[model samples]
Structures are given as C-alpha cells and as structure tokens.
Target: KIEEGKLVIWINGDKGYNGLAEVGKKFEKDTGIKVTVEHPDKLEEKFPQVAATGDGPDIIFWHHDHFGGYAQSGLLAEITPDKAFQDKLYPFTWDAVRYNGKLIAYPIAVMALSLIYNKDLLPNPPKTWEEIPALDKELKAKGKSALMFNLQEPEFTWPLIAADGGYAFKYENGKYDIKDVGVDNAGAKAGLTFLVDLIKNKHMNADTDYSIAEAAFNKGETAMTINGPWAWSNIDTSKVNYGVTVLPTFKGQPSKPFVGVLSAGINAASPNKELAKEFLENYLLTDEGLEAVNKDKPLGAVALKSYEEELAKDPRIAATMENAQKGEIMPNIPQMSAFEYAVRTAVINAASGRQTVDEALKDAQTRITK
Candidate 1:
C-alpha cells in the first residue's frame, strides 16, 4: 500500500521549481500528503540511474521531450489525465506529452522563441531577416547592434533554419522520421550563411553567448534580440521600453521554432503513483491549481485554456502564445541527444566560417548517420 501522507517530486530549473512549488503547497493542503519537490542538480542524468533502482522521485517535473525516451524504458508511467484535464490544455500540449500515441504526462507550459525589441530605440523590429544587414548600418551609427541572440548555440538559430525550409527530423505517422535529417540541405545552408555574413559585417561576433546577448539587450547595446519567455524576468524593463513579437521571417517564410514544453511525468516505480496522478490531474491541471502556481508571478504561457484570459492581459505572454502557434514541438526521441550535438556543432562551425555552410552541414549529416 502507498504511504498515506507522503510524496516525492523532482523539479529541474529554478524557475520551474518556483512555479511547481506553489502548486505543491496547494496539493499538500488538499490531500495532507507532504510533498517534497526536489531540485536535482543533474536531474536528466540522475533520474534514469535512481529510477532504475526504484529510489526515484514519485513525480518528475521537467521538459516533455524526454517522454519518448523515458516511457519506452518504463521509467515513466503511462498516464491518462481525466477528460476535463485533457480538454483544458492547449492542443499542442496534448501532442507534446504523448509518446507512441499515448499520454505520458500532465503537460504544463509552452516556451517558444520570439522577437524582443527595444521600443525606445527601434520602434520597428526588422520584418524580415534579410533586412538585418541594412538595419545593422543604422544601429552601428548609433553605437548599438541591430540584433543579438545566443550566437554560440544552434538551438537559438533553429528558427532561422526552419524559416528557410529546414528541419532536424521530419514527421512520419506522428513520429520522427529519423532518416530524413534535414540539417544538411540547401535551406539549412542559407540560414547559417546569413549568420556568418552578419558576424563578418560586425552585427555580432562568435563570442556573444547567453549572458552577453541578454546584457546587450538590457544595456541598450542591441535594439533587438530573440529570446524565449524564460528570460522575461531578467530583462531590465527600466532601461528600455521593450516589446515582443514572433521571431520575424527569413526570405519569405516565417520562423518555425522548436517550442519547448514543461510537464509532469509520473514515475512507474513510485509507490505513490495514485496520489501523484491525483495531484497532477485532479488539482494541478485545473484552473484553481494553475492560478495557485502562476498567480503570484507569471512565467511562460500556461498550457490550459483557463489561463488564456489571464495571459491575454500581458502583451508579452500574448506574444509568446502567438509565436508558439507558429512553431513545431521539439521532437522527443532518444536520437534527439545525438542529433542536437551534430546540428549545434554544424551551426557553430558554419557561423564562425571554419567551413562553408554546405561543407559544415555535409559533415553534420555524416555524424548523424553514425
């Protein structure tokens, strides 16, 4: 029999924990189950090891992308959230948490990259990626950059590639078609070469990572940036009049970014699965539960329909939700780990001009085949 008044939950990022913990307090009050929400330093690595030994947390609160990998191995329990819970979430949330056509978790939030601009400096964010070079000329005259983002990471640039008709993997029968790795194609080259041209033109350099990019925006060194909702609190609003929109287009196609999901996964081996599921479906997925978590301070767009009115009140949150509608769910498969490394390195190599975009992607294709 499950323990009458105890439950263990794992949370990953600090922001995620902040939101989930408030919900946990409500669950504790309603059920009298003492909930411990753990912030594991290495949850991705630690979960599999500890879970195999049946000593893992009863609930895992993390991204939806790991659902396929964890579910197949029996690390996560196959869950059926109640019909009300299912009806409440965004359509993509349902697609996000499913593994092999079955629900595996209670989906929480959708995080997507969108354009963040300083309304004081540049009232108009560039409408097309093609305008960046000419826009750079004006910003440079003002001693600022036209744009900046996490230049060192491929994930930051996926929208650009996808904007120009590239994808990491194609979908076939609702599952990732691993054979159709799209990173080595002509469209991918078009995207990466554009970034290389920007660096050569002095818009931004390879040394600019996340901290530098965020600081550039906060300090008014850049008029525009592409960042997700997670970084919303970090923006120094007093320094600039900021506005957000969907990350603008490339060539003629609008960006189709990798939308990320934060959701709750039940541990198959947990003794408290029933209690954990109740906490997730009966309480946490409801309107009252969503309010308890996000009421104090909002984060990304909540996955529920109940939060639409609340989210619409904030332009930033509204912008995020609109952009999420334009992106694809980042695929959740075991091959994703290997695919990320290859694609990221290809972008880095191409952007730094270590190799021509075509050459860099050709090598990435070889690595993926391995």
Candidate 2:
C-alpha cells in the first residue's frame, strides 16, 4: 500500500539544501528510505499542476502562506504530530500549519520584521512614534535619514496599519473571511496617513525601496529601518553597530508585523505518506535535526521552545522571537495572495502623492473584491 524506496522534498530557492541533505543521509540510514531534495523553479505553478495529477514530490517545503491553497485543492495531506512533540512547540507555531482545523504542515522557522537600529546613532531605539521627529531632526543635521524602509512594500509597512487596527482580512472560526476586507477601515486610514505625512515632511525618501533602503542602512546613511532576519547577511558584512528590538508603538498601540513560517507538508498524491511522516516526526522535527538546520542556515526564529535557548544566543533571533510571539500569521487563503498587490498599490499611490490615502485605499478595496 505504500511506496517503499524513496521520499522526496522540494524547497524554495537554495538556502537549506545542504542542511536538509545532511538530515537526509541520517534518515536513509535509519529508515532505509532514500531522500532526495530538489531545487525547482516556479514551484508555485509546478507544484499544484503536477500534485493534482498524482506525480508531485512526497513533501513540499515552502512558506505556510501557500498551505491553504494546497489543502483546498487536495495537494496536501493532513498530518498529525506526536502529542509530546506538539507540547514542546511554541503555541504560536500552530498558526502556520492549520487549515479548516486540520494540521497540514510541520512548521519550521518563524519569520517576522523587527526594528533594527544603529546603536551608534541612537543609543536606545525609539519606543513610540512620537519619539521619531526629534531623532529625524537630529539625523537630518548629520546628513542621514532618521528612518527608512520600502514604503511601497506592504509586508514591511503592514505593522504600522496593524498597530492601529488595520488588517487585510478578518478571521473567524479558524478561517479567513476574504469577503470582509478591512484595508479601508478608519484605523487603516490613520496608519496610511501617518506614512504619507512622513514623506511630505521629508523624513524619508518617497522613492526608497527594499534595495535602496537596505543599501543606505548598510552604508550607515540611515539611523534605523524595519527589516527582518534576512537583512542580517549584508548588514553583518557591512559591520554596522546595530541593535534589534520590537517596532515602535503607533499612537500607543503596539505595532504587530506578520509572522510567516517555513513549513513542510506531505503530498496527498504521493504513495509514501507514512514514510514521509516518519521522516518528519523522527528525523526532521527533532532537536538534533533543528540544530543541524540552524547550524547551516541560521533560522529566523525557531518554532520549538526547546530550541529557543540555543538559538536565542543570537540577540537578533531573540528579538525576532519576541516580536513573532505577538504577531499574527500572514493569511494563507487563496485570496490573500491577490491582496498583496492591491495593498502595495495603495501604499505606493498614497506615499507618492499620486492619490490621497482615502482615494488610494478605496480603489484598492474595490479591486480586492473583484
């Protein structure tokens, strides 16, 4: 009833190939099953198309945001974790793998934006939005900006909106109500207007994007920026005196960024599910397995509490864990993918003065429903 020889995995991009390959060797030794890790381009299209035809890999490894679509389309098999293993995991980790109350993936790493600041410029990072104007003035005198980020990217800017009660979609009864879009709500408007005022007041460049903002930060041309763990690679090499902390509160409300999880799910179309589950439970999700992964790739934040002490040795990862514990999961519903473009358009349009915040979001709201 089961495929006996091999189990395969597909990972997004090329970061963890060698780490997983190391785990694969150990797995094959113990379970007598060969493990192959693949680097596939355009998996978003390739996965669903072939998975539905009963020919996909035994496992799919990527962001948890894609789980809902995969589960809904019968591309993923529901999984049950060992109860003891479940108990050792951070509670928030479950947000990534659940769909319609079923467990769909093994949550891997926690990813969220954190406030990264140049310690040399500001000994302590701002704790509230009100503290920024003074820092802005101080930094401007030194020919540097006080704050920067890709104002056009919703992923980095959503926390400002979220702190004031903005959300892309409403969640109810363990599901996303795509019909109840909330991007144009009053709280959202407040956040968007705040961003526009920063540009109008000349605190940040209207044209700054991820590359531009990151490059500026790396070169010490900016005092602070909101970015995630991925930014550390270049910043570390740049050797800036930096510190990581939670985002500044907006109007006394704590800013909350989206927490995305890298996860693994078994393919519903595969005949090797039992073997795949064995690999997940015994080989991949264990402390040693996670240690190997972090040794090779430096996870943003670990999903298991047992691994927290070891991983938190890096202060950057520690701060991210603190932020992620309070963060909401990025929506995985199919509609959530389309919502990104609409939100980004509204952010850019308003920030660039091409449209009023009100006009921009209203137009976005209309497009989301269509």
Candidate 3:
C-alpha cells in the first residue's frame, strides 16, 4: 500500500537536486504526493544501519556499485522497469543494476574518464601512447607536458592495461569471479612497462597525482589530461580551449575506462514501495522527467538513448558517452573494494620503483587471493 501522500528519496549531493525538485513538483501537482529529496552525509554508511531495521528512504538514489551490497543484504526491492523504456537505454547501463539475474536498480546516468586535451595547444590529440613522446617533445619546448593524470591510480591506469587486453577480474556468465585475478598477466605487464618507460624518459611525472595534474591542465600548463565528466565544470571555469575524447589506444587497441552508473531503487521494507515505483518508473524514467532533471545542466551522461541527440549538442558530453560505450562497467561486488586497493598499491609500488611491475602485480594478485 502507498504511504499517505508522501515519498522520500536519498541522494548524496545536489548535483541534480534542483532538476529533481522541479520535476518532483510536477509529480505532486498531478498525483498529490509530496516528494522530499534530502542529501545526508555518509548515505552509504547510514543506509545499511537504518535499512536493517526496515527504516530508510523510500528510494535510494545512488551509485550502482553499492547495489550489489544493498541487494545482497535484502535492502533493495527487485526492479522491473517498463520493457519499452528498458530497451531505450544504453545496454551497458543495465549491467550495473542486475544481481543474480534480477534487476535491482534503474540506471539514470553514467560517468567515465576520458582524454581531455587543450585544443589551442594541440589541435589533434594522440591516437596512441607511442605518440606521447613526440608530442611531449613539442610541449616540452613550451614548458608543458603532453599528458598528465593520476598515473599511480588504478582508475586512471586501467586504460593503459585494458587497452592491451589486461583486466582485473574475469567476468563471465553475468558475474565476476573474484578468484580469477588477471592484473599480472602478459598484457598487463606490457602496459605497465610502457608507463615505466614514459616515466624514465621524463615524459610523465611519477610525482603527479590527480590534484597536480588537474590543476596543471586547468591552468593550461599541461597540454592534455585524463579526467571524467565531473571535472568538466572546473575545466570550463578555467576557460581553456579543451576537447574530450576516449583515452588513446595502446598496442593498436582502444583503451577501456571504468564506467560508473548512478541508479535508483526502492527500499524493500518501505510501505510506499508501490508509490516509489510510480515516481521511478513514471516520472523519473520518462523523456519529460529526464529532460527536466537535466534541463538546467547535465548531471552527467544521461543513460537514456532518447536523450543522446539533445546531449550530443555538447561535444564533450557526446565524447564521454562514446568513451563510456567502449568502457567496462565497474564490478559492483564488495570484493571490488579490496581489488581496487590491491591494484592501486601495485601501481604505486611499480611507479615509485619500490618494486618491479611483475613483482608488484604478483604481490597484488596474492593480496586479492587472501
């Protein structure tokens, strides 16, 4: 049964709050159900505690990565989005919402890292990593770097490995096999060696992290950067002539980034489960609803296919969506937390010269096994 004229939603921040609030008004006008959207600190932490006792927001508006945990704990209601609507979304968005063959959330938007270059400095971005040295030579004369990013982090470095066929875990049959850790394989070795060579040649800085790289790029002191759509606003504010594209290829293959989807699901324990579904499937999933939410500004890459044409007007957004299509959906299992730490530690060790690439990854694999 529906709760008495009210529905509550939990989101982490106000990125899309205004749009949701506006559309939520329309919802109330038509249905007489007041909607409350709130951002509370540590939603992911607080949700589990409250949910265990059958008390939480009627709708959880958050990342798909946490769906595996929530669904596993019986906190999420299984979803059944309208079939026609489901077919209109990017096929990959659905991957993040499923657990054990059942849908757990509805994907609304996507985020993935891509190559963003200063258009005024380099009219063309490199098509492959091999071109970086030459490009670096040109930029070096101007006291700039050809490219910079958090080279020691897995989220950024995954492209280097994945472009050449490396992967962190073996995913098949709609599930990940955490046991089949693959970060130490030959393809991965080749990729890391490429990175090592870049550092040795001074084409890349081993000391640069996300802040340093992004600052340099924003200041136009760096010719290129690898960043996600979330960084677009800052780059735009910096007013640099920039263009976004997929990460450069490695070994003649396109790089693959980790795509994160923002999704929404009903709380299984909510008395307003049916009402929440109405808000989700009727108001939030519709073309009018999505457009309204993004009317003021894009929250990210809208997950619906119908929104693509309108979104493509912004080439950066279009490029991000293209890159996302080539990327892999991040694994949502809890083991992913450990996997990320292991892989990140390995990269830091190898990049800092504290250990060889092979040794670092071997230890990383061992860590995952434990």
State the lDDT of candidate 1 residue by residue for 22-42, as single tens digits: 777888888887787777898
User: RMSDs, each prediction?
Assistant: 2.2, 1.7, 1.6
lDDT of 1 at 361: 85
Where model 3 places Cα greater than 4 Å from the true spot, the runs are: 1-4
Candidate 2 residue-wise lDDT, 1-370, digit = tens: 2244798888876457778888899999987778988879998679888888788789898889988889998789988777787887787788679898898999888999999999988888899876787789988998887898887788888888777878878988777888898888898899888888888888877788899989888899999999999888889899999999988889888787899998998998778888888888787777888888777777778787877767898888899988887668999887876678999999889988799999998998888877
Instruction: State residue 289's C-alpha deviation in candidate 1, in Å.
Output: 1.6
Tens digits of per-residue lDDT for model 3, 229-315: 878889989999999987888888878888899999888888887777788877887778888887755766878777766777888
What is the alpha-carbon lDDT of model 2 when measured against the actual structure?
A: 0.85
Q: Give the clashing pairs for model 1.
A: none
Model 1, CA-based lDDT: 0.80
Q: For each predicted model, how many residue pairs clash, with residues at least 3 apart or on different chains?
A: 0, 0, 0
- Ten residues in a row with the worst lDDT in model 3? 1-10
